[PDB]
Amino acid sequence: PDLTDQPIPDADYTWYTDGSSFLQEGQRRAGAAVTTETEVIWARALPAGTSAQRAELIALTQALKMAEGKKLNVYTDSRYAFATAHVHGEIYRRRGLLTSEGREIKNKNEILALLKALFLPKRLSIIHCPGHQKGNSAEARGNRMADQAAREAAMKA
């Protein structure tokens, strides 16, 4: 409870990611975004039905891919995203498609990509600090910018 990576002191990039998924009355609309404090560096309207969790992972994976070879500090408004980047990768890499007990592995394909994407950046820190997602600081600013951009990419699905 309440865990996070420490931000890299000399980061090349400082981004905020967010996945948004909601029903616009009947249909499920999802969107992902990677932004700075003032600019949207990447946004994409997502396939209908995409869960908020899957969207939050897609956003984060995308940020990692764009930060290849660089030092990245990325903030996630999701507890799921940070937690997912700290799962026991070993499980997602055993032989077969299912868990040991024989069930399906939730979001196996995204998590597998997230895990690979993790080492594209030269140095990486995934910060999850809710106490600053509100108010007026670079973080609150950045959280709003990303939650807004993702929200909009969905609305324009």
Least separation in angstroms between CB 147 and Mg ion: 6
CA dist 50 → 21, 98, 105, 149, 153 (Å): 7, 21, 16, 17, 13
Bridge partner residues of 124 (DSSP): 72
Is 10 a known ligand-binding residue?
Answer: no
Least separation in angstroms between CB 55 and Mg ion: 8
Is 51 a known ligand-binding residue?
Answer: yes
Distance between CA atoms of residues 124 and 149, nearest Å: 23
By beta-carbon proximity to Mg ion, the closer residue of 18 and 110 is: 18
Contact track, Mg ion, 95-124, x by CB under 5 A: ------------------------------
Which residues 19-78 are close enough to bind Mg ion by CB under 5 A?
Answer: 77-78
- The DSSP 8-state label assigned to residue 11 in this structure reads -
Closest CA relative to residue 156, chosen from 23, 22, 30: 30
CB atoms within 10 A of CB 126: 23
By beta-carbon proximity to Mg ion, the closer residue of 12 and 37 is: 37
Which residue from 18, 62, 133, 139 is in contact with Mg ion, where contact means CB under 5 A?
Answer: 18
Q: Which residues bind Mg ion (CB under 5 A)?
A: 18, 77-78
